Amino acid sequence: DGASVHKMALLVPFRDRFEELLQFVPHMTAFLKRQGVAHHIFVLNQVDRFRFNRASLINVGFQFASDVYDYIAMHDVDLLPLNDNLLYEYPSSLGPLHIAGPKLHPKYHYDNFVGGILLVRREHFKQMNGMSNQYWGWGLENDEFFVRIRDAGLQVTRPQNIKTGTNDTFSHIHNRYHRKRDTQKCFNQKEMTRKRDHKTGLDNVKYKILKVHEMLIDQVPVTILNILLDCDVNKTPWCDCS
């Protein structure tokens, strides 16, 4: 019959979370198969020694993923949906589809939280020049992206009529001592990362993909990108506070 189907690039920024990944892959694969979502998991493995930069990794994963994927899911590796009514569907013309809304997320409950699991059309992501590159270490990168969404004249949509709440919609298995949040600030990080970034994004992220690995986990194919991010210490020296 030849019908076209939407295809989701599941982008998972990643470093030192193997145990999480082993739970993530079978869970998401089963979950998405149940709702018939065609997709592939890309593990975006940061292999430079700078601080963790999930936003730049997402930009890299976006560039790498084939054009056949017409939308992406920017997805934390430790955050699993427990409710089948969370549809990972092709977002509407309105803008990004935010799965892990503040009324459903176990921890983050502010109105404009768009983190955890955020689905974006290829065209919309392109239109916004992707994510800022200036976020090294934990925090703020999704909040700046929220402003990009608005500046592009788009809106965030979230699932409606979800009956579960903050305690039973997602599993967030992330112990703050086990997997520490890198909240250090150095140089003028605080002042700079709190400012909207009109200068960097998808179009100027600097990197090399050193290696592409094809992995199977219990028969499920997953792609690993070993990504070497570059840091310009003349611009973002807080990529390394050592």
Q: Which residues contact Mn ion (rule: CB under 5 A)?
A: 78, 174
CB 77 within 8 A of CB 28: no
Site for ligand GDU (CB under 6 A): which residue of 7, 10, 11, 15?
15
User: Which of 10, 28, 72, 77 is close enough to bind ligand GDU by CB under 6 A?
Assistant: 77
CB of 76 to ligand GDU, least distance (A): 3
- Least gap, CB of 44 to ligand GDU (angstroms): 9
Task: Give the integer Cα–Cα distance in Å for 187 and 189.
Answer: 6
**Interaction partner, residue 77 (Mn ion, ligand GDU, none; CB < 5-8 Å by kind):** ligand GDU
Closer Cβ to ligand GDU, 91 or 102, answer by number: 102
Q: From ligand GDU, Mn ion, none, which one binds at residue 197 (CB under 5 to 8 Å depending on kind)?
A: none
> Rounded CA gap, 139 and 157, in Å?
22
101 binds ligand GDU per the rule CB under 6 A = no
- The nearest distance, CB 68 to ligand GDU, in angstroms, is 24
Residues 132-161 that bind ligand GDU (CB under 6 A): 138-139, 141-142
Does 115 participate in binding ligand GDU (rule CB under 6 A)?
yes
Task: Rule CB under 6 A: say whether 54 interacts with ligand GDU.
Answer: yes
| C-alpha–C-alpha distance, residues 144 and 195, integer Å | 8
| Minimum gap (Å) between residue 50 Cβ and ligand GDU | 11
**Minimal distance in Å, beta carbon 217 to ligand GDU?**
16
Nearest to 135 by CA among 199, 215, 192, 77: 192
Which residues in 17-36 contact ligand GDU (CB under 6 A)?
Answer: 17
**Which residue has the CB atom at the shortest distance from Mn ion?**
174
Give the shortest CB-142-to-ligand GDU separation in angstroms.
4
Give which of ligand GDU, Mn ion, none residue 114 binds (C-beta under 5 to 8 Å, depending on kind): none
8 A C-beta contact, residue 134 and residue 143: no
- Interface positions with ligand GDU (CB under 6 A): 12-17, 52, 54, 76-78, 115-116, 138-139, 141-142, 174, 179, 181
